[PDB]
Short mmCIF file of C-alpha atoms and ligand atoms in Angstrom, two decimals:
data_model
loop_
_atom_site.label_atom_id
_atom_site.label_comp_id
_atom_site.label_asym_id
_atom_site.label_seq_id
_atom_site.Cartn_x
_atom_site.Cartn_y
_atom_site.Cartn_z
CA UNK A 10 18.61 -19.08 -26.34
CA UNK A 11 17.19 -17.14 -23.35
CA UNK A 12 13.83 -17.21 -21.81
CA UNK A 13 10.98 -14.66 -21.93
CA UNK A 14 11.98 -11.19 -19.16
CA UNK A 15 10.42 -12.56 -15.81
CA UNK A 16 8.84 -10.17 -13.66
CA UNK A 17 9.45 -9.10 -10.67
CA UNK A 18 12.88 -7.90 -10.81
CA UNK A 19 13.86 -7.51 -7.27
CA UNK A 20 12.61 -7.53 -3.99
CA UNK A 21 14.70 -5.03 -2.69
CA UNK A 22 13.38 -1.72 -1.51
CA UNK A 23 16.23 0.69 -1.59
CA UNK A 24 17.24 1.04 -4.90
CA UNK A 25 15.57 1.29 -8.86
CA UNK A 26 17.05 -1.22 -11.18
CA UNK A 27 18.81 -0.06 -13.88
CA UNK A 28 16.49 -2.50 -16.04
CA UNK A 29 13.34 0.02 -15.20
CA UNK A 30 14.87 3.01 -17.02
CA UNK A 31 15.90 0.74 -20.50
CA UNK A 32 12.64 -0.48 -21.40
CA UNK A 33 10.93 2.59 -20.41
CA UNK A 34 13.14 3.75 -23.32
CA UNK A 35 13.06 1.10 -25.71
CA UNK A 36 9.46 -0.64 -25.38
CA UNK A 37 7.27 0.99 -22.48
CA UNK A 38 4.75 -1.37 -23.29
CA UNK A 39 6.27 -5.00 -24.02
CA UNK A 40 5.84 -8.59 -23.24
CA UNK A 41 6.80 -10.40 -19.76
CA UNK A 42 6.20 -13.65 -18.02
CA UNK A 43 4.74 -13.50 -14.36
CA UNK A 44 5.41 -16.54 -11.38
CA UNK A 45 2.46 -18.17 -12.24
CA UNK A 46 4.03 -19.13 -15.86
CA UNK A 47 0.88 -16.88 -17.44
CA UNK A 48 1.95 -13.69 -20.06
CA UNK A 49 1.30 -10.48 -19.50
CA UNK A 50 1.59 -6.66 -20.88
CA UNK A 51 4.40 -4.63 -18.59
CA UNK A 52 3.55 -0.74 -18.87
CA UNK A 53 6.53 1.49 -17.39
CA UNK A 54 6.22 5.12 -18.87
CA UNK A 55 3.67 8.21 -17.19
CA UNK A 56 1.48 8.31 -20.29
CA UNK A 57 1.07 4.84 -20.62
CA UNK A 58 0.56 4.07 -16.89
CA UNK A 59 -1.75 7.05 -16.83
CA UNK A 60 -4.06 5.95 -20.22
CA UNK A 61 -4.35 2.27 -18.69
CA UNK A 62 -5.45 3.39 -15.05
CA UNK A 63 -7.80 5.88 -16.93
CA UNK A 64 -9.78 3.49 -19.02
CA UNK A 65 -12.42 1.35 -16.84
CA UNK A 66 -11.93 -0.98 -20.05
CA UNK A 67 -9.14 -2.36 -18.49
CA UNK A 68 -10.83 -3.85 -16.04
CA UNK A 69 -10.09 -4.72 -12.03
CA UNK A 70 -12.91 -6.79 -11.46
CA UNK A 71 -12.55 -9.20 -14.45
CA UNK A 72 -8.73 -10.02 -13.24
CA UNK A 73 -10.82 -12.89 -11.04
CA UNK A 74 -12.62 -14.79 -13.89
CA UNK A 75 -11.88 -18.20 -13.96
CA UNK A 76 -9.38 -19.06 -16.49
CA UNK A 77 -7.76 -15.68 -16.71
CA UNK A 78 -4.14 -15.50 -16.91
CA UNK A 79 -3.06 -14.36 -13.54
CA UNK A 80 -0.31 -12.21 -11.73
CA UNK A 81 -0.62 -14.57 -8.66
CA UNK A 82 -3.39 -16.68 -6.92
CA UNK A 83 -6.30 -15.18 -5.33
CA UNK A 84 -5.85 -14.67 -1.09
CA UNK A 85 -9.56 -13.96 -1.03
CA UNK A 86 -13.24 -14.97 -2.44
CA UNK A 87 -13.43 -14.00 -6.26
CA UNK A 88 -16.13 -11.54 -5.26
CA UNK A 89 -14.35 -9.68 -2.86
CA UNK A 90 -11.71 -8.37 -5.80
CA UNK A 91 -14.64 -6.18 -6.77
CA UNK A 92 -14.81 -4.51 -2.42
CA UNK A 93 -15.11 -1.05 -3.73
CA UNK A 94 -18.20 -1.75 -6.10
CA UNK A 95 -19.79 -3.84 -3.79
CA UNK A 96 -19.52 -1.37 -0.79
CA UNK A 97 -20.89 1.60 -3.66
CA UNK A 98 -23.62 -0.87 -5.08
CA UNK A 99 -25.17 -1.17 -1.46
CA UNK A 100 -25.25 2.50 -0.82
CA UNK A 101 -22.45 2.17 1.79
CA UNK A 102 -19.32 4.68 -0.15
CA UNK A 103 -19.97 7.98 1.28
CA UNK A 104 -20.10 6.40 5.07
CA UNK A 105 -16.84 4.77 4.33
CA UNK A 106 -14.94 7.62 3.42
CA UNK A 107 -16.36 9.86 6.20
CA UNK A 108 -15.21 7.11 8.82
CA UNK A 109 -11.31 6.97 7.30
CA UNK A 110 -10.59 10.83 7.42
CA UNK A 111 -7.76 12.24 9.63
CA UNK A 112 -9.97 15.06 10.48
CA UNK A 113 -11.59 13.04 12.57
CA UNK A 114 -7.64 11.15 16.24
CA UNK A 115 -4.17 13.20 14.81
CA UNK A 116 -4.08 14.07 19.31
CA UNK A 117 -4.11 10.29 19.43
CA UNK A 118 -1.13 9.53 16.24
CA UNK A 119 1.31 11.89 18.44
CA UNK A 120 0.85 10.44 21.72
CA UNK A 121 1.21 6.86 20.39
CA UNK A 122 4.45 7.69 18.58
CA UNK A 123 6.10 9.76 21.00
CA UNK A 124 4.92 6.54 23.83
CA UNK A 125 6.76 4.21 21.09
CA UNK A 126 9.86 6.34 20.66
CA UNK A 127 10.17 7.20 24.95
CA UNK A 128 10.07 3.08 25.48
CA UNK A 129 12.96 2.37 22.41
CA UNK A 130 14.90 5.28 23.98
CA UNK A 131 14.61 3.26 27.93
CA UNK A 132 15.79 0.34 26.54
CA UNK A 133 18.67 1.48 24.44
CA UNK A 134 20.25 1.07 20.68
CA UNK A 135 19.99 -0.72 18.64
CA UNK A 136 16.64 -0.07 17.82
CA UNK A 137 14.38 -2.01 15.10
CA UNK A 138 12.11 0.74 13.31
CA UNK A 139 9.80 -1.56 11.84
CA UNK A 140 8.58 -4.03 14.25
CA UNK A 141 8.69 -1.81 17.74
CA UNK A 142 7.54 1.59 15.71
CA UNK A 143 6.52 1.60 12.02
CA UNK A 144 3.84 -1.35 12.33
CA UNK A 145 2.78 -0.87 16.06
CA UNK A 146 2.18 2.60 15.60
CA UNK A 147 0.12 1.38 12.30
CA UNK A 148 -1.77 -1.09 14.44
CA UNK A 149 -2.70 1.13 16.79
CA UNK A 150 -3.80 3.89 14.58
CA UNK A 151 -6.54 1.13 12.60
CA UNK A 152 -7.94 0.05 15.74
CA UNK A 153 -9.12 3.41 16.86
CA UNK A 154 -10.10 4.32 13.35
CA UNK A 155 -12.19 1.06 13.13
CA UNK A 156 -13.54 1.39 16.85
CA UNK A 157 -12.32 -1.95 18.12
CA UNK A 158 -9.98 -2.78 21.05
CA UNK A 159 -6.55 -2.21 20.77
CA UNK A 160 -5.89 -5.53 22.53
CA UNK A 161 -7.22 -7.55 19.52
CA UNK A 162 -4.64 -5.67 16.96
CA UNK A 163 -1.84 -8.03 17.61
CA UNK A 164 -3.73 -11.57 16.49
CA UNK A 165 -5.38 -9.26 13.20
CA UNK A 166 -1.85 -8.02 12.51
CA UNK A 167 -0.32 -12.00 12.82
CA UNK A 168 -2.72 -12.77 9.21
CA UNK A 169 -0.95 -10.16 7.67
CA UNK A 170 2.52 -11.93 6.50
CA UNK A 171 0.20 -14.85 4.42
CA UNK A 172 -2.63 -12.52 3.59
CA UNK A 173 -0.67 -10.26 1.19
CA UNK A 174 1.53 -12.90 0.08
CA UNK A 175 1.90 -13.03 -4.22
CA UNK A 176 2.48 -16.66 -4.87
CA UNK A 177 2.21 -18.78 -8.00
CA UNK A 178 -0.62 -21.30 -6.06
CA UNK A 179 -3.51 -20.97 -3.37
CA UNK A 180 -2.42 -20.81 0.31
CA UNK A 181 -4.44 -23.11 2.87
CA UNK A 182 -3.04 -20.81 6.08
CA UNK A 183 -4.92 -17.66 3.36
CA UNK A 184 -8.20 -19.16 4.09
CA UNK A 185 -7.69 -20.84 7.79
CA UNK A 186 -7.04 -16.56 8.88
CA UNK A 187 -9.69 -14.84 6.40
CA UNK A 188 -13.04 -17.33 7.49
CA UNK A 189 -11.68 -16.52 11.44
CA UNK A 190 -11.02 -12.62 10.80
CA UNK A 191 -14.68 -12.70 9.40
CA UNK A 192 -16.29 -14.57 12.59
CA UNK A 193 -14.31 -11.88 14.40
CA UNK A 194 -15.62 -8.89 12.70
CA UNK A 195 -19.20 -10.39 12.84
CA UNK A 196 -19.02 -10.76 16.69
CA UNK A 197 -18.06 -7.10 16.47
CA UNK A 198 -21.11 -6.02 14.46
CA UNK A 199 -23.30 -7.74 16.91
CA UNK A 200 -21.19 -6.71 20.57
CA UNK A 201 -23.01 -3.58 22.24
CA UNK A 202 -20.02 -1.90 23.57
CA UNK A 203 -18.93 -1.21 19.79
CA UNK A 204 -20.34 2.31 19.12
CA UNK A 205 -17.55 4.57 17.42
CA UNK A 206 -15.72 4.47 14.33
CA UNK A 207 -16.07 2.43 11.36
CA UNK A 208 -17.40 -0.72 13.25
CA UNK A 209 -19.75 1.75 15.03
CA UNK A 210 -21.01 3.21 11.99
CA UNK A 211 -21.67 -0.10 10.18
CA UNK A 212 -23.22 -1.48 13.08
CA UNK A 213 -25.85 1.84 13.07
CA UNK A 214 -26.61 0.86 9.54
CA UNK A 215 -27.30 -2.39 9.65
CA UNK A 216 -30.37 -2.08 11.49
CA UNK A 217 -31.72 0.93 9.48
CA UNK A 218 -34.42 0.17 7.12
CA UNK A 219 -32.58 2.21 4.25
CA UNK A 220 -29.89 -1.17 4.49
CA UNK A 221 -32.33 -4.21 5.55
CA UNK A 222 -31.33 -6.04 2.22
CA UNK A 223 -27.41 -5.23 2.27
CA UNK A 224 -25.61 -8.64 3.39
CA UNK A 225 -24.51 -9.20 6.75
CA UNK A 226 -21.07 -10.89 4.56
CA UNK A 227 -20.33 -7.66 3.07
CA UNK A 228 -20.57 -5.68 6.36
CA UNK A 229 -18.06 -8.45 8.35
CA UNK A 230 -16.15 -7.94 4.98
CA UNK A 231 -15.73 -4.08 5.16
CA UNK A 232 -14.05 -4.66 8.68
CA UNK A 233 -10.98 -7.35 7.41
CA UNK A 234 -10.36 -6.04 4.00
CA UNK A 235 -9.73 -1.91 5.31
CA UNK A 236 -8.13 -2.95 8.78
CA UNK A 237 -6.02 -5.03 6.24
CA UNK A 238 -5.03 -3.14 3.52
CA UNK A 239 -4.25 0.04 5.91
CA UNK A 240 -2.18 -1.37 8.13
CA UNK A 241 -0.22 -3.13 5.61
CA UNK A 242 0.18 -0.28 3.35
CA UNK A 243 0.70 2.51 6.03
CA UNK A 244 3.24 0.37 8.08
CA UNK A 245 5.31 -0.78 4.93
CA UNK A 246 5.45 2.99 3.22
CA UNK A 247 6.60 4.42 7.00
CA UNK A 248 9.35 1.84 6.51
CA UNK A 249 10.62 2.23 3.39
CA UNK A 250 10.72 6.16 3.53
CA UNK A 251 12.66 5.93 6.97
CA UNK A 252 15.25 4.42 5.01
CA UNK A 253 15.13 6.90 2.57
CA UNK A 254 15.71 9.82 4.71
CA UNK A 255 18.56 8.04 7.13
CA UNK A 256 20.20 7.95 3.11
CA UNK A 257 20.15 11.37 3.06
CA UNK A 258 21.56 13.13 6.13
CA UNK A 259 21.44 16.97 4.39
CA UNK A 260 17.34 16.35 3.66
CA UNK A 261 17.08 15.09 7.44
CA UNK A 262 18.67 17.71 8.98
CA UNK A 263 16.42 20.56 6.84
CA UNK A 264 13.54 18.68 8.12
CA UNK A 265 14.25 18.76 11.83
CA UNK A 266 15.46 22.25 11.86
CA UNK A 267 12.11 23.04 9.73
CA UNK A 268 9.30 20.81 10.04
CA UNK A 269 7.14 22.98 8.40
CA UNK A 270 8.42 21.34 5.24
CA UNK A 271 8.17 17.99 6.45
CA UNK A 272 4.30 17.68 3.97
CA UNK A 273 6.34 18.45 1.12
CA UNK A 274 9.02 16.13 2.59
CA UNK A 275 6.43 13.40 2.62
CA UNK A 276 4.87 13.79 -0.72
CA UNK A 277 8.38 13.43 -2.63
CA UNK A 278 8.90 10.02 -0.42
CA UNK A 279 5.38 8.61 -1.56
CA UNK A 280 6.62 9.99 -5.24
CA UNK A 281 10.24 8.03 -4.61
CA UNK A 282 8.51 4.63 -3.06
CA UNK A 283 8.98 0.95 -3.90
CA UNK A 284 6.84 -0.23 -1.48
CA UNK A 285 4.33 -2.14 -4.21
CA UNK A 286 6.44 -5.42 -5.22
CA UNK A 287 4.28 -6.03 -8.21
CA UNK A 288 2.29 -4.06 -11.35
CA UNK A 289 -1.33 -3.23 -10.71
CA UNK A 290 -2.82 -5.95 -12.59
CA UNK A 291 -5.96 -5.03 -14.75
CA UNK A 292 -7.52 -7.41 -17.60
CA UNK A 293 -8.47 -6.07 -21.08
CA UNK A 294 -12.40 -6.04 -21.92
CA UNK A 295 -12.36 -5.09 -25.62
CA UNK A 296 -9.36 -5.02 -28.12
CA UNK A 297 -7.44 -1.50 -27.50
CA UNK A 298 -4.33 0.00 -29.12
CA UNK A 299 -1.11 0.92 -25.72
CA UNK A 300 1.70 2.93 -28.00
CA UNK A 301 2.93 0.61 -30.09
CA UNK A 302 1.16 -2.33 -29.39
CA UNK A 303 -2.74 -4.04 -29.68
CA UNK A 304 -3.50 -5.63 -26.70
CA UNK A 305 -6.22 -8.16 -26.97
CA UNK A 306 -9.36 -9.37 -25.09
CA UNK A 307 -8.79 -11.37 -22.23
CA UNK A 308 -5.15 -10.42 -21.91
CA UNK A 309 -3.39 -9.21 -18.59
CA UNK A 310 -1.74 -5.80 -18.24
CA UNK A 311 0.43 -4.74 -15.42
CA UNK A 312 0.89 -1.03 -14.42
CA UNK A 313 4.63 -0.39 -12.51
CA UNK A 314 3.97 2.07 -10.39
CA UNK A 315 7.86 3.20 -9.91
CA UNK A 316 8.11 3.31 -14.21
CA UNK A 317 5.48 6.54 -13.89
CA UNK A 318 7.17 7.86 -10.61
CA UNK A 319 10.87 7.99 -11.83
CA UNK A 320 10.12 9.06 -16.00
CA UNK A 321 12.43 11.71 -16.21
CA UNK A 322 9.86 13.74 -19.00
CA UNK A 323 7.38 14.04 -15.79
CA UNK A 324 9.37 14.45 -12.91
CA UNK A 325 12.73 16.39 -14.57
CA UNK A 326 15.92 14.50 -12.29
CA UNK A 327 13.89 11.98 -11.21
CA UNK A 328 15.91 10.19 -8.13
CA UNK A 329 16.64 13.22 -6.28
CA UNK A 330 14.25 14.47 -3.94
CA UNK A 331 13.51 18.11 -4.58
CA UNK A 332 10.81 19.99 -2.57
CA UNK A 333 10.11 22.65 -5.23
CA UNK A 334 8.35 20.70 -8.28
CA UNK A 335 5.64 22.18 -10.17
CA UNK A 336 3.52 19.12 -10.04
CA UNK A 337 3.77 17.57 -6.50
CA UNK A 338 0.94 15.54 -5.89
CA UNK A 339 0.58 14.35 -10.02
CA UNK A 340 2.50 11.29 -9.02
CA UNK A 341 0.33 7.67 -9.08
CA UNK A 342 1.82 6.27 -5.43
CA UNK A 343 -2.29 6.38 -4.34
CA UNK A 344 -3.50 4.74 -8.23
CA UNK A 345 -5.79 6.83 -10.32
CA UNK A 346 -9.22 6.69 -11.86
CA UNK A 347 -12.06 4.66 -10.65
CA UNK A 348 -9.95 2.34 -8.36
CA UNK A 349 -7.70 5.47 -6.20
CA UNK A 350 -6.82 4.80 -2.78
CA UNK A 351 -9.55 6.04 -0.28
CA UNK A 352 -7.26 6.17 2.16
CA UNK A 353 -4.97 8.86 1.18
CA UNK A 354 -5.56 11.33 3.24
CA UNK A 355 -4.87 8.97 6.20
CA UNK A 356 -2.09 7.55 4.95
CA UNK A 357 -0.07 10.91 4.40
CA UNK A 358 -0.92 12.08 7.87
CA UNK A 359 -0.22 8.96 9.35
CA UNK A 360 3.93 9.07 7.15
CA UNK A 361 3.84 13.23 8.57
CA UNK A 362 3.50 12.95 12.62
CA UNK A 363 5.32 9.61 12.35
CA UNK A 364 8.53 11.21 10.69
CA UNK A 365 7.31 14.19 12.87
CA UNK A 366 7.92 12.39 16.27
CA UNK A 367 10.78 10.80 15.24
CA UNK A 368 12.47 13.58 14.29
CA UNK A 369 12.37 15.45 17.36
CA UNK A 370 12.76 12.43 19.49
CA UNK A 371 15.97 11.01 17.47
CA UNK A 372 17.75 14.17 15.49
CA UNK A 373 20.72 11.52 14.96
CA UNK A 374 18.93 8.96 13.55
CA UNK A 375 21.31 6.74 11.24
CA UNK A 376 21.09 2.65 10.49
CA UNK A 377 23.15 0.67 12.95
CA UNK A 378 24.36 -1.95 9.93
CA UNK A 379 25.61 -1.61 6.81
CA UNK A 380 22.96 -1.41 4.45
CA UNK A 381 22.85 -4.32 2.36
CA UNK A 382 22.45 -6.70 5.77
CA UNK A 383 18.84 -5.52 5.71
CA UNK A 384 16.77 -9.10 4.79
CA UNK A 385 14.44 -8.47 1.81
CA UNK A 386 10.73 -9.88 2.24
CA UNK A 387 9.99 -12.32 -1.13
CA UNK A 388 7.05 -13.51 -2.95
CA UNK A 389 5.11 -10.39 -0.98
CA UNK A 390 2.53 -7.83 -2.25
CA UNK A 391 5.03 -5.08 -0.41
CA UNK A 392 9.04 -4.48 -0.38
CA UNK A 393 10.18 -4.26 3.18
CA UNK A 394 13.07 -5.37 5.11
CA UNK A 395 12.08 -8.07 7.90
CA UNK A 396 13.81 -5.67 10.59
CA UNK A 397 15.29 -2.10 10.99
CA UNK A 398 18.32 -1.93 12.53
CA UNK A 399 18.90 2.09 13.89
CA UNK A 400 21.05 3.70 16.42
CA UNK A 401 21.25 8.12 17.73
C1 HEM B 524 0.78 5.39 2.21
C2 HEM B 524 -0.22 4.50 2.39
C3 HEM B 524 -1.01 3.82 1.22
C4 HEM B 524 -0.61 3.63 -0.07
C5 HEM B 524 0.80 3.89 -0.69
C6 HEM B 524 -1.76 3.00 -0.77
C7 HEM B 524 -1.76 2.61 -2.12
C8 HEM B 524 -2.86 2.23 -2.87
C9 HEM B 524 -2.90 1.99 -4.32
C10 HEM B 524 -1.72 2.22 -5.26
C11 HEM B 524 -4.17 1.66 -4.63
C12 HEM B 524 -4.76 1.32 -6.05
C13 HEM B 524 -4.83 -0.17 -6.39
C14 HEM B 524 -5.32 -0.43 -7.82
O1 HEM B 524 -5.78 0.49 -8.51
O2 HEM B 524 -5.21 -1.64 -8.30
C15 HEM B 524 -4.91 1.60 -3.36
C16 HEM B 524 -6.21 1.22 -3.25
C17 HEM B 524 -6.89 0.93 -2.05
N1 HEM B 524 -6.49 1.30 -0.78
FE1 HEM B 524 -4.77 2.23 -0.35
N2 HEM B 524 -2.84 2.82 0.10
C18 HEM B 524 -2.39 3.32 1.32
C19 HEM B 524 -3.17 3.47 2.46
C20 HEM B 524 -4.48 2.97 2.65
C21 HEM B 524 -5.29 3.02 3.85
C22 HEM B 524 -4.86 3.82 5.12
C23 HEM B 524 -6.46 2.42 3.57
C24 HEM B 524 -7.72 2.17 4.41
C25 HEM B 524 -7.81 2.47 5.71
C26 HEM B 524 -6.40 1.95 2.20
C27 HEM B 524 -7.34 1.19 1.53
C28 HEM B 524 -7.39 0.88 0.17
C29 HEM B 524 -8.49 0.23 -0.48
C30 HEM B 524 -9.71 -0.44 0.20
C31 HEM B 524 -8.16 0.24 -1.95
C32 HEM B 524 -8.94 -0.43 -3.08
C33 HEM B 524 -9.81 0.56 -3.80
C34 HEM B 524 -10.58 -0.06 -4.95
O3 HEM B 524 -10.47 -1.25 -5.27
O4 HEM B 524 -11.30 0.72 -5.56
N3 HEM B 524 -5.17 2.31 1.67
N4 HEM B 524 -4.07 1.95 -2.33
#
């Protein structure tokens, strides 16, 4: 007798299990348990993937209702699962948007870099990539976008490493860093000196008639959910797909003697990625028919990003990273449908002059340990390693 296929499989980000490419074979839609002891739907194929994400009755926002079964426990106020709605509902999406652009600030990426890269190349290997480059250079990036002091990046960034924890129970620390973060952000809103970026921009609308009834919660809530999700996203993809190119010395080398292809370079290392540790958990509305299965009303269904990135009938040779595909950009590393990342656009351009710097800074870049020493993160929203040994 064995128990019911537990999910996640591994916290490693550096390889695919084996496991990923057998069910996607044998049942891409079939029956796990997650760490909370609840049941849920795992979805591994394109199509699938693609047809859940696709179909608002599958439902983001419901995945909070009390007495749901769950993927993990809940590091925020049920409402604030449903940000993006809230933020459209008030008349607040199109000022967003405008306010996370690269177009902008990409003057201000190569400087920081190439200050980060000067200071590990004064002090001498070995080198760790993710805590003196990857997530400063992250840090630094979200503070400018959000028009707040660099200075106050450090203490935000400290929340991060119990905010986007996935554990089985509530988390007191959780709640002890979100209600400060918000008295933080509200101070901001109300500070003078605070009159570019994001910040600035909320701060403008906020005392314009057109937004007298919009709540001064959602507006402190804008400022610790993006600064959040950003920097943890940006700073753990820069990681992962450093690894991934120190792997493969032949792909490096093209790059620095032609970093012209380094775009293309980027988009098949979002396409490669195993930088989300869990599904995308949505919760079905209405009783509808996945391939060969009914799922029911009120169940859970998780969509693996990496079973839709590595199906061989989309992406022909799927591990490989080849920077002549058809269909570049068709992968799901940003979501799709109603719920897809608003921040792609800065979170490519961020991966590009990172890699960019790097490159031209360090042409002999190659890890300084053997590669299964790097330490795993657990029970996290992300894979990353906890440092980044390198040496040139
Ligand atoms: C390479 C970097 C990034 C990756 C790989 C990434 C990935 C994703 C994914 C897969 C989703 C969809 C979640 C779902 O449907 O359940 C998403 C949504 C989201 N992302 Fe990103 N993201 C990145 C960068 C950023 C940045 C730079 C920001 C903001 C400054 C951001 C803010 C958000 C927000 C607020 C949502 C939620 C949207 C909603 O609920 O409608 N992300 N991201």
């Amino acid at each position: 007798a064995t128990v019911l296929l537990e999910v996640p499989f591994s916290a490693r980000g550096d390889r695919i299990p084996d496991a990923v490419a057998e069910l996607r074979t044998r049942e891409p839609i079939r029956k796990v348990r997650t760490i909370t002891g609840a049941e849920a739907w795992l979805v591994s194929s394109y199509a699938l993937c693609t047809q859940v994400l696709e179909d608002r009755r599958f439902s983001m926002k419901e995945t909070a209702a009390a007495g749901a079964p769950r993927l993990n426990a809940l590091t925020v106020p049920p409402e604030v699962v449903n940000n993006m709605g809230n933020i459209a509902d008030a008349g607040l999406r199109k000022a967003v948007m405008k306010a996370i652009t690269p177009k902008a600030l990409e003057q201000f990426l190569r400087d920081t870099a190439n200050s980060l890269l000067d200071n590990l190349i004064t002090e001498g290997a070995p080198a760790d990539l993710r805590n003196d480059f990857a997530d400063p250079l992250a840090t630094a990036l979200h503070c400018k976008v959000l028009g707040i002091p660099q200075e106050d990046g450090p203490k935000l960034f400290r929340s991060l490493s119990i905010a986007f924890m996935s554990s089985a129970d509530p988390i007191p620390a959780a709640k002890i860093n979100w209600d400060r973060d918000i008295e933080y952000m509200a101070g901001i809103l109300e500070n003078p000196n605070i009159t570019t970026g994001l910040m600035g921009e909320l701060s403008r609308l906020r005392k314009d008639p057109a937004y007298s009834h919009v709540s001064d919660e959602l507006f402190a809530t804008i400022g610790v959910t993006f600064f959040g999700a950003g920097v943890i996203s940006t700073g753990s993809f820069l990681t992962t797909a450093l690894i991934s190119l120190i792997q493969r010395p032949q792909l490096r080398n093209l790059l620095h003697e032609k970093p012209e292809l380094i775009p293309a370079g980027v988009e098949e290392l979002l396409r490669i990625n195993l930088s989300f540790a869990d599904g995308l958990p949505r919760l079905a509305t209405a009783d509808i028919q996945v391939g060969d299965v009914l799922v029911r009303k009120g169940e859970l269904v998780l969509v693996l990003l990496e079973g839709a990135n590595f199906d061989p009938e989309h992406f022909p040779n799927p591990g490989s990273i080849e920077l002549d595909r058809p269909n570049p950009t068709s992968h799901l590393a940003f979501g799709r449908g109603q719920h897809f990342c608003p921040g792609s656009a800065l979170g490519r351009r961020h991966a590009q002059i990172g890699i960019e710097a790097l490159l031209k800074k360090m042409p002999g870049v190659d890890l300084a340990v053997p590669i299964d020493q790097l330490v795993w993160r657990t029970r996290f929203q992300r894979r990353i390693p906890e440092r980044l040994p390198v040496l040139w």
